[PDB]
UniProtKB/Swiss-Prot annotation, chain A:
Following DNA double-strand breaks (DSBs), it is ubiquitinated through 'Lys-63' linkage of ubiquitin moieties, leading to the recruitment of repair proteins to sites of DNA damage. H2AK119Ub and ionizing radiation-induced 'Lys-63'-linked ubiquitination are distinct events. The modification N5-methylglutamine is found at Q89. It comes from Xenopus laevis (African clawed frog). Belongs to the histone H2A family. One of its GO terms (biological process) is heterochromatin formation. This is Histone H2A type 1. Coiled coil: none annotated. Core component of nucleosome. Nucleosomes wrap and compact DNA into chromatin, limiting DNA accessibility to the cellular machineries which require DNA as a template. Histones thereby play a central role in transcription regulation, DNA repair, DNA replication and chromosomal stability. DNA accessibility is regulated via a complex set of post-translational modifications of histones, also called histone code, and nucleosome remodeling. The chain holds residues 17 to 119 of 130 of the full protein.
UniProtKB/Swiss-Prot annotation, chain D:
One of its GO terms (molecular function) is structural constituent of chromatin. It is found in: Nucleus; Chromosome. There is a cross-link at K90 (Glycyl lysine isopeptide (Lys-Gly) (interchain with G-Cter in ubiquitin)). This is Histone H2B 1.1. Transmembrane segments: none annotated. It comes from the Eukaryota. Belongs to the histone H2B family. Keywords: Acetylation, Chromosome, DNA-binding, Glycoprotein, Isopeptide bond, Nucleosome core, Nucleus, Phosphoprotein, Ubl conjugation. Monoubiquitination of Lys-90 by BRE1 gives a specific tag for epigenetic transcriptional activation and is also prerequisite for histone H3 'Lys-4' and 'Lys-79' methylation. The nucleosome is a histone octamer containing two molecules each of H2A, H2B, H3 and H4 assembled in one H3-H4 heterotetramer and two H2A-H2B heterodimers. The octamer wraps approximately 147 bp of DNA. The keyword GTP-binding does not apply. Core component of nucleosome. Nucleosomes wrap and compact DNA into chromatin, limiting DNA accessibility to the cellular machineries which require DNA as a template. Histones thereby play a central role in transcription regulation, DNA repair, DNA replication and chromosomal stability. DNA accessibility is regulated via a complex set of post-translational modifications of histones, also called histone code, and nucleosome remodeling.
Swiss-Prot record, chain F:
The modification N6-methylated lysine is found at K1. There is a cross-link at K72 (Glycyl lysine isopeptide (Lys-Gly) (interchain with G-Cter in ubiquitin)). Core component of nucleosome. Nucleosomes wrap and compact DNA into chromatin, limiting DNA accessibility to the cellular machineries which require DNA as a template. Histones thereby play a central role in transcription regulation, DNA repair, DNA replication and chromosomal stability. DNA accessibility is regulated via a complex set of post-translational modifications of histones, also called histone code, and nucleosome remodeling. It comes from Xenopus laevis. This is Histone H4. Keywords: Acetylation, Chromosome, Citrullination, DNA-binding, Hydroxylation, Isopeptide bond, Methylation, Nucleosome core, Nucleus, Phosphoprotein, Ubl conjugation. The modification Phosphoserine is found at S28. Coiled coil: none annotated. The modification N6-butyryllysine is found at K12, K25, K58, K60, K72. The nucleosome is a histone octamer containing two molecules each of H2A, H2B, H3 and H4 assembled in one H3-H4 heterotetramer and two H2A-H2B heterodimers. The octamer wraps approximately 147 bp of DNA. The modification N6-propionyllysine is found at K12, K25, K58, K60, K72. GO terms for molecular function: DNA binding; protein heterodimerization activity; structural constituent of chromatin. The keyword Transport does not apply.
Length: 103, 78, 97, 95, 77, 83
């Protein structure tokens, strides 16, 4: 494989094939699938890192979507990246406006 | 039919949205807004399904519809 | 006894913000979707997954809109959301003219 | 029976790489797969537009690198450039 | 429709802005012009939304919290 | 020559005229610095995208098409300068 040759866990062959049939360009280079697969692998690594952290905070062994929503929205940069994305069964962060609180 | 979106369901949605006090005319306004949103999204989804020559509106048609409207959704085969 | 008005509302706010389950009972929403779709093309069939995706998107959009409406109402020194609040939020968003 | 594809196994190996004693739910895997597909689409389309803008025929590692810097916020983009350069260099090392 | 921001201070500001990302950068005058057009359209729209916010407060004078509210509702950060 | 404090090149009358075109009648005092900040952020983002496009182009000059591309990226498409 090439993911072994690239130290990657994501499949380089799949991303190269998708780049080809995705009609993004007439010709596709060799390094491009490797670079792209690395970028995706780290992005999901960050997502899974924070989601597992949240699941540990919620005392759960298996990650459920609410953990993903907490991880994305709590993190400012991931929230900015997924600014126009709604995660199913994700819910919302706990947030109550000050004036609504009792005096 | 449209009234099937009950007043209390709208209160629950607002409560999840952080609202404390709600007006009477709110509920009807929200029914109208939800009607408009569903109209647009379902119109795009139907357009897709018709282009697919299928009598079944599929989940991917819905996902493509929200993608067009800049309201991307996850968890249904993105 | 009696809870003072406005306290149980905060309790529900805490309750629903910690949970993710849908807040509209399924069947009326499904019937509403079916009615709306019928006006665009007849004798149509829906996958349950498509209908679920529609509900998720609609509920999330409504929650975000209610958040903006509450912010707008608070900006007006108010605590109760009123239709002008939804109208202003939608206008600034650019969905309503 | 149709042999539909996904990214589930690779997402799971990554999860073990970062959280060995942690699992994930099925629809949650669906959300991970949707996120991967969305990011792939965004970056690839950005690279395609980059190629058209410069009147060139190939989407190379440079094009996706600049597309990543264009699409991602600062710090994630920094890390993304580092990982992509590292992986591409090590791949060019092997054969 | 003529521009309201004066051209030379805007050009100096943009040159400083670009310098902080990367040094030794030159500009086509048309590029600066397009930047100014985009900026003016954006802030005119922002002022419109601000005025809408201020009226919603039963006020007539736009106040900084009005633009904060408008940019929050716009989804900007 | 070094450049400094050019954000104050956006004078108060300029912002006042700009609000006038926005339909604003009465303007509060501290507004002006906030408009300076908002313009600062907008310029920061747009010029970031344009500079990256120039960097891929291997050019030492920003061209109008770079600005147009960056504006299209921000969901703020502009007509009248190509593209």
């Amino acid at each position: 494989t090439r993911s072994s040759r690239a130290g990657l866990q994501f499949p380089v062959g799949r991303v190269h094939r998708l780049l080809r049939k995705g009609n993004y360009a007439e010709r596709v280079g060799a390094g491009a699938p490797v670079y792209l697969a690395a970028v995706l692998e780290y992005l999901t690594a960050e997502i899974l890192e924070l989601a597992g952290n949240a699941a540990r905070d919620n005392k759960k062994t298996r990650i459920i979507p609410r953990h993903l929503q907490l991880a994305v929205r709590n993190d400012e940069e991931l929230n900015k990246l997924l600014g126009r994305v709604t995660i199913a069964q994700g819910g919302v962060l706990p947030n109550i406006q000050s004036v609504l609180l009792p005096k | 039919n449209i009234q099937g979106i009950t007043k209390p369901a709208i209160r629950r949605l607002a409560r999840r949205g952080g609202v404390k006090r709600i007006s009477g005319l709110i509920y009807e306004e929200t029914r109208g807004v939800l009607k408009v949103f569903l109209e647009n999204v379902i119109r795009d989804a139907v357009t897709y399904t018709e282009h697919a020559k299928r009598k079944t509106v599929t989940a991917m048609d819905v996902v493509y519809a929200l993608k067009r409207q800049g309201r991307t959704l996850y968890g249904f085969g993105g | 006894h009696r809870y003072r008005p406005g306290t149980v509302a905060l309790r529900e706010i805490r309750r629903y913000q910690k949970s993710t389950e849908l807040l509209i009972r399924k069947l009326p929403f499904q019937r509403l979707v079916r009615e709306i779709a019928q006006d665009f093309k007849t004798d149509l069939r829906f996958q349950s997954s498509a209908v679920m995706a529609l509900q998720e998107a609609s509920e999330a959009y409504l929650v975000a809109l209610f958040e903006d409406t509450n912010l707008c109402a608070i900006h007006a020194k108010r605590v109760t959301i009123m239709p002008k609040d939804i109208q202003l939020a939608r206008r600034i968003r650019g969905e309503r003219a | 029976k149709t042999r539909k594809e996904s990214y589930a196994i690779y997402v799971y190996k990554v999860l073990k790489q970062v959280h060995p004693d942690t699992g994930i739910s099925s629809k949650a895997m669906s959300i991970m797969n949707s996120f991967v597909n969305d990011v792939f689409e965004r970056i690839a389309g950005e690279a395609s537009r980059l190629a058209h803008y410069n009147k060139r025929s190939t989407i190379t590692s440079r094009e996706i690198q600049t597309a990543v810097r264009l699409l991602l916020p600062g710090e994630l983009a920094k890390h993304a450039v580092s990982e992509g350069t590292k992986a591409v260099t090590k791949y060019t090392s092997a054969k």
